Amino acid sequence: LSCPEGLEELLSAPPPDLGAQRRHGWNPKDCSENIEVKEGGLYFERRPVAQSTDGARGKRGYSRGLHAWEISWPLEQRGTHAVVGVATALAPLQTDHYAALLGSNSESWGWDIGRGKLYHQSAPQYPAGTQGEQLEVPERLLVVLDMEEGTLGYAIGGTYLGPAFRGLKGRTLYPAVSAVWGQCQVRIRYLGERG
Structure with missing residues (x-):
């Protein structure tokens, strides 16, 4: 298990209310x-x-x-x-x-x-040693930022796929996407903080 310490507890908690989801949502x-x-x-x-x-x-x-x-x-x-x-x-x-x-x-x-x-300033495949054509990321994915280990990773259907990026300690990092599709609707749902 490469899971950040406390991820299971964070996900098991009562999810942040609409107020919190708005405060941590798109700016x-x-x-x-x-x-x-x-x-x-x-x-x-x-x-x-x-x-x-x-x-x-x-x-x-x-x-x-x-x-x-x-x-x-x-x-x-x-x-x-x-x-x-x-x-x-x-x-x-x-x-x-x-x-x-x-x-x-x-x-x-x-x-x-x-x-x-x-x-990052760019490419390796993620998850580790998969082929792109061999994967389809479904509609919902979890973004997991561990600022104690300085790692960014992702979970799909509640399964953590391991760290994608390291070396993040000492930065201030914001949820982000970049998109090219007209009238795309990209939802962000903050699931909370531990710490």
Whole structure:
């Protein structure tokens, strides 16, 4: 079990209420001009814009403890580049072409849930020693940020897939995605903190 200490307890707790999910949800003040944050942070909608990759950060950056949130991203709303992970407050959230914007720099770490590749200033396959064409990330995935070990990993159907990224200790990291699909609806559900 490569699971962060306390992940089972965090997931077994009463989930954060709607207020908390909104406080830790997408930031309307920290997203691409082509993204509209909906329901006070619970999801965003990318506007139908040609030749654009558009990202969003969570309202809250984490520097300590164990944090987890579920992303819900419908399979038919992913297009060519659907990347899920974290960013510093300095990651660019918009570019004028279709690309894996999340993880294309020093300020972001992303899992391409289409191709299964890991991007940081960039790619290895995740999970460990799988083939991309041989995997399909379902609609809901858990993002697991352990700021005690300085790790980012993912869980699918409540199974942790191990650490995707290491070396994160001493950073302040925000939930993030970058998207290319017009009118995609990407849900974030904060599941809480331990610590």
